[PDB]
Amino acid sequence: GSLVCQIYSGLFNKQISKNILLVNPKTTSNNLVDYNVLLIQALAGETEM
Amino acid sequence: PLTRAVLAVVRVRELLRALLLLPFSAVGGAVAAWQGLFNSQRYENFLMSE
Amino acid sequence: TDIPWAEKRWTLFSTVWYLVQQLRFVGTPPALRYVAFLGWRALMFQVYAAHKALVLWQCKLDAGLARIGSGGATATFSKTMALRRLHWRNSPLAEALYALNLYKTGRVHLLPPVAKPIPRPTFFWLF
Amino acid sequence: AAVDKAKVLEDVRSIISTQLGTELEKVAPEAKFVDLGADSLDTVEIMMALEEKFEIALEEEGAEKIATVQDAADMIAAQIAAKGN
């Protein structure tokens, strides 16, 4: 939520760059769905970056 | 008595010198007020709500 | 994520409200918007103070009316009705019927049910 | 869902003292309102000051039966607790 409200208010281009670590328990599913990549692409598409 | 007379003269001429530049310093103070509104945390809260 | 599909109807009224809103959001600089925001806040504080004064006045008035109603002792009012008046939870008809009930039978604790929220009006492709 | 009832109580008592004009030692958690000098038209203004300070809305049916400071505190805490849902 903080990332979204920052990107929409235009204040993102002047913040200090961040590092964030996303962990998700092991992937041994029959599927190749990965919710890290999906969540970050949803963040980048909701804000149109 | 004499040195405070010279000080009184410099004080009167300081009155004049302060008043002759009063429009310039007036616009300067207005600009200072203007650009002071736009670096608070209040303006940041407004930007995030918008 | 929770938008009711009625706030996403494309109608002829909304494609003009789009222009009003796009002016306010993209065609006006944020600094003037900020100044207007401050002014509107101050105005709303004054208006709220006025409304609170009026609500207390209404409480005395109806506490006085219940006296005529009962003819005798009753002088209290209802705090429930005061709080409901402050949060805009009464329709005007409910206020009138409460006033009448007070004037005729005292009975300060009999309250109209409550107002329900107004649904969004829709016509057709029009609005 | 979990409210620090202690903080709510201190703030209630401070608001009550500032509204009535009596000092904070006299406001006890079991003190009724009638003896602190409160008369109907002011057991309401106290409710409005409370809501205005805490930024919440009071449940009216229970708000009809507020007569001691502890009931005020418990009403406010049950309101703050039920905020998300």
Side-chain angles (χ1 to χ4, degrees), chain C residues 52 78-80 83 87 89, chain D residues 48 51-52 60 63-64:
Chain C
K52 182 158 49 176
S78 213
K79 305 170 189 158
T80 307
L83 302 168
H87 301 300
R89 312 194 50 75
Chain D
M48 288 169 191
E51 297 187 332
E52 176 164 19
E60 304 107 7
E64 182 93 79

Side-chain angles (χ1 to χ4, degrees), chain C residues 45 48 52 55-56 59-60 76-84 86-87 89 109 111, chain D residues 40-45 47-49 51-52 56-61 63-66:
Chain C
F45 271 117
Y48 168 67
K52 182 158 49 176
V55 161
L56 299 188
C59 281
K60 286 154 129 223
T76 37
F77 58 84
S78 213
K79 305 170 189 158
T80 307
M81 201 66 180
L83 302 168
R84 278 171 41 169
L86 198 83
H87 301 300
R89 312 194 50 75
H109 283 357
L111 299 155
Chain D
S40 38
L41 249 197
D42 89 71
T43 322
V44 248
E45 310 167 64
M47 297 307 127
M48 288 169 191
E51 297 187 332
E52 176 164 19
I56 57 128
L58 284 163
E59 193 286 311
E60 304 107 7
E61 296 319 310
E64 182 93 79
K65 320 146 192 178
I66 280 188

Side-chain angles (χ1 to χ4, degrees), chain C residues 36-74:
Chain C
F37 171 78
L38 297 175
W40 182 247
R41 293 263 301 198
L43 186 61
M44 284 330 280
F45 271 117
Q46 296 323 300
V47 172
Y48 168 67
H51 182 72
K52 182 158 49 176
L54 183 129
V55 161
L56 299 188
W57 188 81
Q58 256 179 287
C59 281
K60 286 154 129 223
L61 182 141
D62 76 70
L65 220 113
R67 184 154 148 192
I68 287 99
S70 149
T74 327

